[model samples]
Target chain A: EEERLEREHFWKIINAFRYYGTSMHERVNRTERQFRSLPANQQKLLPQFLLHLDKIRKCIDHNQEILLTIVNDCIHMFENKEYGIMPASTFDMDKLKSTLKQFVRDWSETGKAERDACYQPIIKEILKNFPKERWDPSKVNILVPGAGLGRLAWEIAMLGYACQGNEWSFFMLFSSNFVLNRCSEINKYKLYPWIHQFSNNRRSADQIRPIFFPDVDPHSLPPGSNFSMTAGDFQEIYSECNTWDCIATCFFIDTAHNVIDYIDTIWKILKPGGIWINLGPLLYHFENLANELSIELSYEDIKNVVLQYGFKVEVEKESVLSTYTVNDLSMMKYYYECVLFVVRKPQ
Target chain B: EERLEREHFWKIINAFRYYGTSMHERVNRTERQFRSLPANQQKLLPQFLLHLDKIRKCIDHNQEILLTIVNDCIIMPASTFDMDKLKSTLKQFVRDWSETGKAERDACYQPIIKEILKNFPKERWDPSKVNILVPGAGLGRLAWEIAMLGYACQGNEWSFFMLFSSNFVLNRCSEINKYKLYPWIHQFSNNRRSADQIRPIFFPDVDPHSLPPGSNFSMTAGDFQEIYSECNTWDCIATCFFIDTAHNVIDYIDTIWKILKPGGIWINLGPLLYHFENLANELSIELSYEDIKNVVLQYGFKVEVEKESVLSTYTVNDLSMMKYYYECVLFVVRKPQ
Candidate 1:
């Protein structure tokens, strides 16, 4: 029988050739190829820069077994856990410090055509399948849990529903709130251009551009419509005793280490005949349960879980091509077939 | 499109012809000898023979039609078609499908298209109206499979080279060649099993059952951006290893978003590697997997499935001299209403 390999060991050899000693070396090769094609004066102009690069190259060249050890240890820190998904973002404080503004813009940048595309499925599902009686402005009480940046919940409220966004992460809470309340105008935010965050050609110069928070206050909230953004782990932030007319999870389902907890919470907080619309991939962000790494909960299994929780499937759509964020430069596709389902709590 | 691309394709086609010309006789002899030997000597031999006949007939039929098209185009001096380039392209294409194609399109793609079928289950949509478009279809095999699933499928290709070859396979081929060594073979995947490790040079055979019944499908050749220009109409787009073919990743996302109907879907599976990165003068800047996601959304896509590091292989892996595996990604995006 074939033995299972940890994702760590699986990525071990790949990282060795990929993330180490290769980037700078390739840049040098590219630079050299360009230099040979340049005119005489330009070649003369490049020597000083080349000299400094050569100086750095000599110090950086001493990579041996000891050097290999440090690189593996660093990549190991980002490996998805044996039981669940790893945080696939840069965790270093100083590094994230520079890149956070752009990360926040992934959702809020309204001016650019390329923006974060998450959470719309919830709105589409609710509008498509809900009874006409429930479609009245402020008639449906919707809650968005793990509502990062609050754009999704904010969107729900703007569509004239009484919406509440519950978020736990400080990184998202502070940033998302700043955008919704203060940045009413387009291009209200200036993000430090984070290059090298994506893999592209070695030739692009760093270009920082305008990013934004969508104009959320098109008008005052409707008479009965209520909008609330709460902070803290939504699991603890929400009350089981109370129920809402609808509960929407936007790419937020996978944040749970144990998804059953979220399912239980959604089941309890939804009023009878309430809607549970989910819009996200099953890539459990903190998916570890027990000591394992890559968890196996197929969509078929998740649907079964929802059924056991007393929800009847109203609308089921699969493989909705969606985008999560701008990809780190690689030849890989970051497009998603977002899982969309609308389940109704028993009347 | 260039000398280099042609050269690479030439070597590939030459390899196919070399293998194809020899395998017909060799596999036929093997089948006869094996017939005389124990019936016990089989694993996928029977399975192999089944697909072989179907693929063999389809390929053989395509070749004759492709040649006729090439000859007619040249003889008519059709100002519309580029004949000098067409000859080389057709020559290489003929060699590719009939010669040594089993290595690339057959192995690299067929399995992924199979997964595409699973996403759009037959029960979910009407077989007659479920129109599917495969952009950048390689030799039309995936399109054939999509047709097999009984969808109104069209295989769209841009390379005059790829277009002609696929045109023949999808439309020109005859429908009969069951239980015959296709007279074209070489280089097949070996079973880990020792005796079988010798593998099928794609030993010839195609059982009739292996062929898809009647699929409502067609073949269209055009630039993808132009073909899918109008906004929000198609039922689905099955793109495999086609996105990176664009110079700008944003262009692909834009076109897919525009062509899809509200609540429509696109199933895309392939590696992130830009096939043209090393090619000269190609606008070869590759965006991150993240950038692609970022751009696709504003274009009206919501990712439904995002699986990373799904392993796959391509070209030739003789298990010696050449071997490669890509831990590619599989994506399914939807245009939610």
Candidate 2:
């Protein structure tokens, strides 16, 4: 029964790619209705607008084709049998869109500004505490929990540290696996990540602009690199005590329903004198959901808890503005005043 | 049926005061749920309930005002009052009539007003001779602002909750800042501070009757398409945050083009957040802003002055951690002679 449930969940994500065309066409059709609504006297203005709509339709069609190719690539890479499936839910479609947006955030050249703001800080903190000169970069074992799309962990591994990234969502894993394994060249794929939402656009063109990903070749890491990714819940997978020299979380801890448990686990797994570096907002992901246990604590309270657990705080900074998968051209923006800190397990 | 409709109307009016009590019950239900959670999950979650208690107190304050206003009308127990609509009605007060609403109003409304004044200058063109139509005018502030400039302005609103509340704020209130209303109490999340949840915003920032003497100003109730079918009637049509309220936005465009006289000016603003896009059992043809501009150009309106992506907010709590901004498209177009 458990295996049956797993197969069902796997196919749901696999088949979600099929809805990309139909869902986007639904939006394009709205524009079509407007073009048709033109009165006979107003028909003169129809030609140019109709041309634009045709162009938009083609873009949607192209996006669908690329999605199917990704689906096939995923199938071959995972060696899973083709399973016929039903229509995907709106939730599945949204997750699919988020996956596309993640490519922009994690792999595209345009996303470097955001990466420099969020990921660069954590990398610097790691280097400061465990300098390559003093600490044997090859010997240091670093774990990146919620290493979305494996960018952080991959970057850590590129620095000569033994790095392992953990992720739970199949939506992230399937696509990330495709990029990390199959992508041999920089900017190998094209994506229209911004097209799904129709509001807050500065120009109409902003909606459908294409973004190319894998700014750096995923396969370009030095030979014999100590890099790998584990797919499972961070809490369940990382059970070996005193195994990791460092744990780096970027926008990760807030994903926990019981954040305290995450803190306990981080402390439990880290070797004595192990360093834990964190940066992200306390926008607790599960705070307002129904039937979910979310321990929503203020940043002040969270910091107190970390210190109370016998961990020494080394560095602390507050209100560090960071954005996660933001469309910079959008009129609307969300800024997370992320708290950045470093804590050490007492020797 | 006529008698039944009248009773139903009175029932809604009488039940409006119960919004606060019902809201308290909803919060109480959440608290009960929190109480029943396992002991371990319950320890660090008291702050959430603390936020809830603050919201409850704000509801109490809002209820007192609603009771006072409703009792004055001598207005039943059966016609159900919608708590969500009532809460939105309260927010509209903060958007349109309160001092707190001033920044939003200035951002969204001032440009349209300034455009109208620039083209139809008070020195050359007599303001009294020109007629301005404002459709989907939520709380009557934009219309009032035009009336203050001495134009013959009329506000049209379709929602009953907005209509009734706007009537009270515009006609009954004689002084500026007369009533205290807690507008942000309904939203429980995204708060930077607990005190912000209960912040009181005093309404009627300006005296409602401050319009110039002899100014022909009024508000028309009901749907814009239903009422404004006659052609070549209005000299100017001002739509602010209004066009996307259509079932088929094409109808709105057709009506706007048809009703305005030849050489009439159309001033428009707001994002294309089509009101019916995700609502169940509604026909929503949501055209992008680019497509909308194409439709307008096809309708024979000549673009005169246009500003795209003019940043603005609508009834947003400035102190709240979360904010929604509209890169609204503001334009002035002319009907060909």
Candidate 3:
């Protein structure tokens, strides 16, 4: 039974990496080539690349310990890799080397299981903290920076808040706009399943349609309403400080090599007593040299730093997403563990 | 044709009054007897009597008008007394009147129409002005008040505005809750084929069993969102001194009534105008009053009192009901109109 479980776990991790890498390899390669092509631009892109590199390093480190456990449980698997008889697909030398390095670092910081355990509380807290009231339609001003695929903004608007999204990446911004339009259409008709649950079952199709597309004619709700999308670096966007009542950043802070700058931007935009909710991997565990260049900071360190900046931090327990799973088998073992934090500016 | 129209209008008015009075008499008598019984305490009896009184007043007004209209138009083949004569022998007249009147009051408000023409502007009466320029045109009372002064002020209020105004008139004439605007509209539409022809198809009523008993009831579901967005700019708005008539007075005035132009006048009158003195200061509006004439003006315009005799004639019961009814004050304001 142990052997079977180990085999399944290895396969799952291998499959996940393969799926992610395959889907993203072309874009990643393009970005990498762009960095190398222009030496002058390299300085600008370096910070962002380093942020991504840290995430890769952390992921490898976490997976390495798990792989080691499987190897220990099944000596034959380790022996095969040592003898170089394993298939090339299963064991790429460069990939294995990088992955192993990440694993070693992750194991040093947290035993394989400990790293996975951190995310459980975060997910639970987010689900628990989700607001019960639909976003008030009366609020006219909204700003969402670093909106990934615009899912969070789309969700907020469906609840009635008018929201605008900003994304730095060309591809991400385009994809986010596409998703937002799709959601707007679905929301207009009250066809989305998740919205029904969010609305507490009192929602009707007619009611949902108008809210989703507030500007659309009621007779023929042709798509497109109050949502607007802006594509640019965060620094370039003209945003009013202390105006927005709520701001959401998901999987964002971990990518900020200049953590202080990112936090400052959020503080500037948020109104007094405004809420800032965030979800991301712990930054201290990030392995990129750029991330490491700053004083090593854990989740608690980040919280303290924010508090020092006059924010009241409320760090929730870690929780998991649906992404995490047991090895190769179809069954999932653990969800993607993440930490959620809610900070409020003083009134 | 003009004489015929006048005759028909009177008949309709009389029929309404006749029906209303008969119902009121039956319900009030039963209600009084029930209260006088030893089983009902005097204090508790007042509560029932109040409900009965409300019903009686509403029915009396409607019946009186309906009977007058019927008689004047010669529409009724037989008199109301003749119709009730035979039925009176089979049922207790007082008990029947009490139960029927209570039921009708619960189910409906008497319908009445009153038109006021404000001759202030000779040009077209702008709808946008009603929303953006008028400080308090929700029910068009300000328009009515202004019109009574011989101003050719044509109101271009939204459909919902018309519905709300109709509700206020109906409630005032019938002596019932003015808040039940939407439900009353629905009831009216259901009862009158002509109404259905004029209004849009409304949402079906939710199953009563599905809803909690005594859920918060809103009179009308006015689309303020649509109204605010569609009409943003207007000219020449006016409001009469109306301070009372809201549970949360400030909230109602600011949220529903004060979507007005920047430089519009906000005139008001009443003894309690002092309470809103601080509000005017906070909003940066000028305040003035004319209390010698029984009017307290504020913010932008003079609050002048109209003679009581000049006001439309209403039954004594209606006057009493309006007095005891919850929060209602006299205020008049303008929105640069």
Candidate 4:
């Protein structure tokens, strides 16, 4: 009976988010598409997502221009060498493979129908392992690098922590802004409606509408809109990242063809004693003809490599199915499951 | 000019007191007379004062009846010794002396008052000095004690430190109900007229009536009345004492004659007499054979000599009269004059 009552209460809270999901997704997709069609000048007014998209394409092509741009942008973002890019061979490709494998495996195993079931344990485990008390709400400084849809970043901020979502993919950046707005709006109404009201009344009526609908004029967006879309690649944006208390990377490192470069970027940006929470597939994905190019690394290898970079593995949850996106058939059946890794820099 | 203003101010104050003196004197005389007239049953009503009178008399007679009575009536009103008794004694002295041109004489002795009079200072200190020293000067009892005879008066403590310390002692000696002093004052003063008004304002009435010929009331009444009366008599006796300090063999004798009303009985405790000759010559107020007979024989004040004993109590020094460190003299005298 107690379990039943608890389930009922949980469902009541989940239902509200569930009801808005489809509309929110549709609006976000449409906005991203619209934003992509805009001219370069008009696009600049939006988060620099398109520019990142071009950079990502260049990175995939191994173009030097892409690397140079990333480096320059990173330097601009993180002015100090202590936080900016540095040449390092600390990353292990074999370890990156294992981490990606576990993450993808988890994503594929859990379906949307089981999202609630999966989320409960995940949230419980995360909360249990994470030093919630140490993370002071007042002094919260969070960075979500390669934050796709800013799910965890939004969650952290909603919990009263200060957070910044950084995405290297233009598409994901746009999508993340949309999700961030909807999630932040829901959170504002839930926790601080009076503050939201005051902010809305004080700001221009149309200041934040574009955060949810990227095609809209952000300058003319309505007040109370909670979208935050910032441009640039992760390395570029995170160049000045020493200030962040925690850097979160979700489904990002595995996508990097040069895993060493990606890990180096992470190391450069994170402050000493900062935390890194990564969730993604541990296996490399190659074209159909180069099936041998696909290399998978085990959890132990990943842990070893992270430690080699002077990071202490605080927590490493095995791969779990992406139950949160179960309704997305692509994710429910074919999506690679992901492992959750939390590593902290030594003092 | 300030001295003249002070003199005028006091004259005005005394004029009011003198106007009310008849009523006040009548009240005191009537209360005594009425109390004496009460039947045995009604006598219980006077238990409060009667018990106090008994204690004072016992203390005078070197009798140890107080410990027994005080212990038995521990919770009763009669046994309580409120500080207002002392404070009221002090205020009454100032009010009367200020009225009787004696304040000026007292003022002369005050160095600051003298300074102001000589224009060495811009402001007179008589008002402040009278307020500060009245109680310490041993004149408070006569002033406030007389006022307590009838007219409403309040005792004002000049120094907060003295009031605070005295309050502590009084709280220890009295039942807690003694704290109702101010409330009791308010209750008594509710129907009285304001000092500036020459009318009687009844507590519940809206209209005022003419003050019953010569009736007077003032703000500082409840606490000051009794002290003023006590100080008046103390000043008179002290004056006589200073003049006759050269007299022989008069223990608490000076205190006994001046402390109470005429025909009133005087009680003494452990008084010693060694300077009768000096007293006789000082005021030329000789101890006549009749006077001696009146005090020792007619008044029946003499008692059998008792063994010498020391009392554990406090002493007061009155520097203005040049008398220093006196014994704790608890004696009672009847009102004759």
By the TM-score metric, which is better: model 2 or model 4? 2
lDDT of 3 by residue, A125-219 (tens): 33444443543343644566766545445544554456677776433532333333332332232111111111111111211221122122222
Name the top lDDT candidate.
2
In candidate 4, how many Å is residue A198 off?
49
Local accuracy of candidate 3 as per-residue lDDT tens digits, B209-311: 2223322212233333334442323333333222332222333234322444453333332222222222321221111112211211122334332321111
Q: Which of the CAPRI classes, incorrect, acceptable, medium or high, describes model 3? A: incorrect
Supply candidate 1's per-residue lDDT for B47: 46
- The better-scoring model by DockQ among 2 and 4 is 2
Residue-level lDDT of model 2, residues B21-42, one tens digit each, is: 6777667756776676667556
Instruction: Summarize candidate 4's per-residue lDDT along A1-347 as a digit string, tens digits.
Output: 85465344333322322223232233234434544554554334334444433433332233222223323433343322333112112122222212222222122222223433333343343344345686455365667665554444544555555666666543343233333333233212111001101011111121111111122122333433233445456665567646666666665665544344466677767777777777655434331112222212234434545666788887777545443222121100233345777788776
RMSD of 1: 20.4
Q: What value does the lDDT take at residue B127 in candidate 2?
A: 90
Tell me the tens digit of each residue's lDDT in model 1 across A291-335: 432222345556766776678998888665565544333333244
Compare the candidates by DockQ and give the number of the best one: 2
Which ten-residue region of model 1 chain A has the weakest summed lDDT?
A201-210
Lowest summed lDDT window (length 10), candidate 1 chain B: B188-197
Docking quality of model 2: it rates as acceptable
* Model 4 chain A: worst 10 consecutive residues (lDDT sum): A190-199
Worst 10 residues of 3 chain A by lDDT: A191-200
Candidate 2 TM-score versus the reference: 0.86
